[PDB]
Design a protein around this ligand. Structure first.
Ligand SMILES: *CCC(=O)N1CC2(CCN(c3nc4c(c(-c5cc(O)cc6ccccc56)c3F)C[C@H]3C[C@@H]4C3(C)C)C2)C1
Ligand SMILES: Nc1nc2c(ncn2[C@@H]2O[C@H](COP(=O)(O)OP(=O)(O)O)[C@@H](O)[C@H]2O)c(=O)[nH]1
Ligand SMILES: [Mg+2]
Length: 168
């Protein structure tokens, strides 16, 4: 079967681990150690294709390193996650997109913008502002809740479809 290597990136606390564990293990984690960086795998069917999702949930220190560049470079697509109630996490996205372009040495890398925690009140990032950003990047934007499951499959499956488009 076809393997898709996905990498989940974004600020501490946006829900990278919760999104990954909801997709792979079908449950919402109320807490997940922010030092646990690992890959999680699941066989799924997307548009009739049986495939293996190989998802790297990034964690540890906010730092640049050749060591990290080496394994991040293996990613075929990037899920760029911010939390809709954390303006700083939205502002951070630019730094992730720029480093993805650097490590992949390309202006054309499969990417999806994800606004997580859609279930929470008191949002600080307007959906239309995130939609405008995604339009400016030429990538899809999906609002998700790792808690309720809203948009979770759509976010990961859309990234798989972006990877297929790049492979042509
Ligand atoms: C609370 C812990 C947690 O969940 N964290 C996510 C993070 C670990 C990794 N992550 C991170 N932050 C940034 C950058 C990268 C990054 C670094 C590389 O060397 C290579 C690549 C390649 C693609 C995407 C991202 C990277 C990173 F993994 C780069 C800039 C954005 C910040 C940055 C300012 C260092 C944070 C802690
Ligand atoms: N209400 C709500 N809480 C969430 C959601 N996603 C993550 N969380 C919570 O936010 C915190 C940070 O999530 P985590 O997955 O550890 O974020 P990470 O640091 O990006 O891996 C945890 O307490 C999660 O339970 C969500 O969609 N909705
Ligand atoms: Mg985590």
């Amino acid at each position: 079967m076809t393997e898709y290597k996905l990498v989940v990136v974004g600020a501490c606390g946006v829900g990278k681990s919760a999104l990954t564990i909801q997709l792979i293990q079908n449950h919402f984690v109320d807490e997940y150690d922010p030092t646990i960086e690992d890959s999680y795998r699941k066989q799924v069917v997307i548009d009739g294709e049986t495939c293996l999702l190989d998802i790297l949930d990034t964690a540890g220190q906010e730092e640049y390193s050749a060591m990290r560049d080496q394994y991040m470079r293996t990613g075929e697509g990037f899920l760029c996650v911010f939390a809709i109630n954390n303006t700083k996490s939205f502002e951070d996205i630019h730094h992730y997109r720029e480093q993805i372009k650097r490590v992949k040495d390309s202006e054309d890398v499969p990417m999806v913008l994800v606004g997580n925690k859609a279930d929470l009140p008191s949002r600080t990032v307007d959906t239309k502002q995130a939609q405008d950003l995604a339009r400016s990047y030429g990538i899809p934007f999906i609002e998700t809740s790792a808690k309720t499951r809203q948009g979770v499959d759509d976010a990961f499956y859309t990234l798989v479809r972006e990877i297929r488009k790049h492979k042509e």
